[PDB]
Amino acid sequence: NSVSVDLPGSMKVLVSKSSNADGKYDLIATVDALELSGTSDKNNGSGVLEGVKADASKVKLTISDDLGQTTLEVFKSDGSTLVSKKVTSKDKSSTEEKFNEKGEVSEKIITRADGTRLEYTGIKSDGSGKAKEVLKGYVLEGTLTAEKTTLVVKEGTVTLSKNISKSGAVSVELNDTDTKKTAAWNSGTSTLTITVNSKKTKDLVFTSSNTITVQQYDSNGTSLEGSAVEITKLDEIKNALK
C-alpha cells in the first residue's frame, strides 16, 4: 500500500510502501483536484509526478531528493513551453512565475517566509518591470531593472528610495530638492540616518524582519532618545520624511 508524505507548498504525496521489480516506487498526489502520478527510484516521496489540467495543459510536480523543495509547473498542452512555475524552497518561501508564449518570465511573485512579498509585474525581455513590496500594514511601489528594484516614497521635496540589488542587498537613499534633509546609509546596521542643519534627526532601520523602525535623536543631534518605533502604515514613513 502507500504512506502519506508532507511536502513544502501545502501539498502531500502518497508513496508506495514497497518498490516494484525495477526498484521503483509509485507516487500519487492530488493538487487542487488534479490527480498527478509518477514513478521514482527513491522511497521517501521525492521524484516527479505528472497530470493535466481540465483544459489539457500539462502539469508536473517535482519534489527534491531530500523533500526540501517542490516545484509545481504548468505547460502548454504539448508540454513544450512553460505557462507557470511555483517553487517552494526549504525555508518555505516561494516564487510564483508566469511566462509568455516564448517562455519568458512576465510576472514573478516572491513570498518570503514571513509572508511579505515582492511583486514583479509586466516584466519585459530585459528583465525590467513594475515592482511592489508588500509589507505588514503597507506597500512600497516602484520599478524593476536587471540591476535593482527601486521603491520610492515621496513627501514634500523629499524622495526616499529603497533599492534592492539584483543580489538582494538593500541600500536606502534620501534626496531633497530643497537640500534641507540629507541622509547617510550604514550597510552594516541597515540604518539610514537623516540630518538637518548638521544635526542628526532620526534613524530609519530597515530590519532583517522586513520592517522599518524610526527613532529620533535628542535636540543635541548626537544621542538617540527614547526607543525605536515600528512603522505600521505608509503615512508613518511619510511622517518620518517631514
Side-chain angles (χ1 to χ4, degrees):
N1 221 358
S2 74
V3 294
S4 187
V5 177
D6 195 58
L7 303 171
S10 297
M11 291 173 292
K12 290 177 183 286
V13 62
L14 298 180
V15 59
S16 61
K17 285 222 71 212
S18 66
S19 69
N20 69 19
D22 302 322
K24 292 183 182 190
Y25 283 83
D26 299 322
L27 303 171
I28 308 275
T30 310
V31 177
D32 182 51
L34 301 185
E35 299 297 331
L36 311 180
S37 71
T39 309
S40 180
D41 64 5
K42 299 204 28 155
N43 82 330
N44 66 340
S46 68
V48 168
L49 302 82
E50 299 173 272
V52 297
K53 294 192 80 140
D55 72 357
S57 299
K58 306 301 206 178
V59 179
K60 184 176 283 178
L61 169 60
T62 303
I63 301 150
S64 66
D65 286 357
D66 62 3
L67 313 176
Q69 178 171 101
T70 59
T71 299
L72 182 65
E73 282 166 323
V74 181
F75 300 81
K76 294 298 197 188
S77 65
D78 63 354
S80 53
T81 315
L82 271 172
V83 172
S84 66
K85 180 173 168 189
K86 174 172 190 194
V87 180
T88 304
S89 289
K90 71 178 176 181
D91 62 351
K92 316 304 183 291
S93 69
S94 61
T95 72
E96 293 171 275
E97 292 170 294
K98 297 169 182 168
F99 305 82
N100 73 9
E101 318 77 41
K102 297 191 227 181
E104 298 164 351
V105 61
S106 61
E107 173 188 297
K108 183 194 290 192
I109 312 302
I110 299 169
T111 304
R112 301 197 185 98
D114 67 7
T116 64
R117 308 196 301 270
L118 285 164
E119 299 176 343
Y120 297 114
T121 64
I123 305 171
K124 303 308 173 185
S125 70
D126 65 353
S128 67
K130 292 302 231 274
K132 185 180 298 217
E133 193 172 20
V134 180
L135 298 316
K136 191 166 180 283
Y138 57 99
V139 306
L140 304 175
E141 290 181 323
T143 62
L144 166 73
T145 72
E147 299 192 356
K148 63 189 181 116
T149 301
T150 301
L151 309 160
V152 177
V153 181
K154 288 179 174 282
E155 166 60 37
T157 48
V158 174
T159 299
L160 182 75
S161 295
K162 176 186 173 181
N163 301 298
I164 307 171
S165 85
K166 66 188 306 214
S167 65
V170 173
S171 59
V172 184
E173 58 194 289
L174 183 147
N175 297 290
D176 185 354
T177 59
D178 269 19
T179 70
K180 186 196 124 107
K181 284 81 158 170
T182 56
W185 175 247
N186 182 333
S187 61
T189 61
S190 291
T191 298
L192 187 79
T193 297
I194 304 175
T195 284
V196 173
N197 203 26
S198 290
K199 282 192 175 170
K200 298 175 179 181
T201 56
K202 54 202 90 198
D203 274 3
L204 277 64
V205 182
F206 296 74
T207 72
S208 57
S209 297
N210 305 116
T211 67
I212 302 167
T213 71
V214 59
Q215 193 175 358
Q216 323 293 314
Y217 284 77
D218 180 82
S219 49
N220 62 23
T222 58
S223 51
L224 287 166
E225 72 174 18
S227 48
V229 177
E230 186 180 281
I231 297 289
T232 71
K233 58 182 82 179
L234 196 61
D235 264 320
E236 294 163 353
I237 305 180
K238 290 182 174 270
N239 292 345
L241 299 179
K242 294 178 182 183

